[PDB]
Symmetry: C5
Subunit: 202 residues, 5 copies
């Protein structure tokens, strides 16, 4: 139903505060992050650099966006410029994230938001072992760039489902674990997810 | 060529157009047609399984709320796509952004049919095995909505495919053997719902 | 008239008038005739030539002219012309059909508007084309053809109308120009029942 | 949350992003510190380095301060809502490519912290990268258009990537003042000396 | 005085017409341009192409911007979007000018504007001689892209003794001479565009 959709969008834009974190109660916003690797385009064992493509499945809640969907759309697509989005960054990225897909999020009637862009990006990590049976394991650390743990908490197979069958590489395993970083710059602590990409030449 | 009519039609389109809302009529998905007309193959990396291609992405759909009586006014106008809803199509196996080489205008017809046909340069990760053999390489490109499931958006091939190579450059060092563009459906771990795509199979070889 | 061209308040008023009456998204068809667009490519440099891939990298000044009589003003005592950001004007939606890269505009995106309604837009463009590079090393040279036309307006809406470019081409190029010729064409495409006009620019050139 | 929204609205009511936040007829004291993360490419024939670093930048605008006794201490703010120093690297030969979200932190006392991850290429002396004492690459950073009476600039094993082909021996960052041909006044700058070598 | 600054910026934005040439009386705008070379990055003797970095020192007046500064700041930095800037282009440039510095101009209380971006750009020019002792002489013409001489005059700055003063010692090249002179180009039609012709005499070290 189109008018319903347009009304939901209007509602979302009236209540959405894109530059403000949506803390519910005084708890931090829980953001779920899962990288789905699609391809591995270039590897350099010499420089320890990696060029990759992945779907960054990112979800969280803003209960204030919720509506009653008994007689209306459960979900709509929304431009992320209308929404708050976690300021995630990869601490070992050496190129800026090149978003390859339309910048739309899904908002579910319960206030859940799913943003899943396809990103091409290059990293500085441990490429040693590529041409080995065991293969290399390359570790990507992703976290909020400016919100510490009291403001944002970050939580998280072989990706047979998504990985290209045409890549000069294959994935042996991927694991994602929660992890904390604290830096000389800032007293408050930051949460990251450590994504371990275990892969080898095909 | 009545200009003031063109200006009024544009006014009405922008009054009516909701660029961020899918134009569903009744309770039926928006029926989007996509077809890739191939113009060039620029680079083919046998090492890495990548191809850089140029194609006109013929995209059509209807938004009957935009329609107008054209018995004594212009049948069609050109419109900037930022005034229009445009389907959120993406190539699921692309490895670069789609580079639009042409003016980002769509044609809106008086019955509310919309035609957007950019020329795109884009790189894909696909099977490049066989490119220098007689029977050639076959690269597969999947195009579908990035965020709308099939209850929301249907995507189908266009009726005419016989023109898929008609505009391919005779100066390309590659030549096209066959193209097929066929309906397919994709489901995933993330989302319980299904997405429609047109799978394009591009069979080509080095001259 | 000349004697009033540098009247600043007059220039600002002309700009105001243009922005009031300009419809940047609506083609300026006068009476019931197509907008007559004149296109002339003035080649400046041939940068990269590849005889294998049949690709050429070039720089040219794209002299584009057309008229919109609604922009017109009486200049017998005010500026004859002004510079205008093209984002304030309607501009033909020209595209080069055999381009294989985005046209990189290298100059300020300003057009000239003349008091009689004429609009003159001439960007410096760098762009890569897919065209015929065979024979670039011979005496008679290669002939690279570039096809330029409106991307979405057919012939009833926009019509297109078109030397050795001695005057413009870089003396320091590795290549030289024999001839540049430009012919009108009209074509119907598989997508659409109507016919689109284009210009074919034949760039006859050789390695020095 | 509502308190966050209101602080942000106050910041945007009082912030003049194109006006330097001078207090008391004193220049804005900007403190800079580069935390090198990666050395990506060293071209010995052209004397060019490609590097990734965290540009820790801080200053105060006390007209942004609020009473935090019963509201948050800090928020994140888009830098387009804030004045930021117009720092530039004088020996840069590419645009700064900002790799991170363009958010600053604003602290309830009016302190602003902006720390982008930046990838940029520099013209500097890479002679010696294949020696044990290494090469020393000097990066000169300062305000591009604000002289000393307007802006003053004042000055990595934990940060530097272990996977880099390179290794840092020593980073030093020293104040410097200069007077240029265009203009009578003097501009302050920080000279960042990066001593590094190939493993 | 910060408030004074915000007021000056407000006055400038009340008065400045960013798209209209600031002709004073009935005369052309006098723009002064000078390139201070910082670097020469790549040079190709076959293709006759150079890649250079330079500060594009640009100045002109808009008296309507002027204000009394006896008890207020004599200078402010303004974003160039708030100002009219001349539409300069290098007639033999073969890439877009990559601005490397913050896009801020200085406005001085007497109405003088200084805009001086650091630009990286590639040109087509005579690279023959670059490996000989006498070196190559590459010529760059800079002028208004759309304003003829009766609207904008382009002249060198008074000072060009400093053209190579900030040149990188770590360049694989070196500059022997720089000359920056008045020129006029004319084409079909009677209008002439004034330009500054920069002759860069350089060689490989
Ligand atoms: C323009 O103005 C002059 C008066 O200065 C008048 O004589 C002339 O007829 C006008 N032109 C038109 C077309 O109205
Ligand atoms: C801060 O607010 C608290 C109560 O909200 C009050 O006790 C205190 O006096 C205030 N301090 C300042 C500096 O305004
Ligand atoms: C600790 N955060 C995460 C990485 C860098 C650092 C940071 C960046 N911008 C503003 C901050 F307050 C802190
Ligand atoms: C006439 N153009 C040239 C090829 C395709 C066709 C076209 C492109 N976009 C919108 C159209 F209506 C038509
Ligand atoms: C259905 N799309 C195709 C790929 C992934 C999935 C998707 C992408 N972005 C947001 C979604 F909700 C779903
Ligand atoms: C100074 N340029 C060089 C050629 C002519 C002149 C020019 C360029 N673009 C638009 C014009 F109106 C004039
Ligand atoms: C301090 N910068 C370095 C070069 C010149 C000076 C500068 C740059 N832009 C505008 C100025 F006013 C001054």
């Amino acid at each position: 139903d189109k008018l319903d959709r347009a009304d939901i969008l209007y509602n979302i834009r009236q209540t959405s505060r894109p530059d403000v974190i949506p803390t519910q109660r005084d708890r931090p916003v829980a953001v779920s992050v899962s990288l789905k690797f699609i391809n591995i385009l270039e590897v350099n064992e010499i420089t320890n650099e990696v060029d990759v493509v992945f779907w960054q499945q990112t979800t969280w809640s803003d209960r204030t966006l919720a509506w009653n969907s008994s007689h209306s759309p459960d979900q709509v697509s929304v431009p992320i410029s209308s929404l708050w989005v976690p300021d995630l960054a990869a601490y070992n990225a050496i190129s800026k994230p090149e978003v390859l897909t339309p910048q739309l999020a899904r908002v579910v009637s319960d206030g859940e938001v799913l943003y899943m862009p396809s990103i091409r990006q290059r990293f500085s990590c441990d490429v040693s072992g590529v041409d080995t049976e065991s293969g290399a394991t390359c570790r990507i650390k992703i976290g909020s760039w400016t919100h510490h743990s009291r403001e944002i908490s970050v939580d998280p197979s072989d990706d047979s489902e998504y990985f290209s069958q045409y890549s000069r590489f294959e994935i042996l395993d991927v694991t994602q674990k929660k992890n904390s970083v604290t830096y000389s710059c800032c007293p408050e602590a930051y949460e990251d997810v450590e994504v371990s990409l275990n892969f080898r030449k095909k």
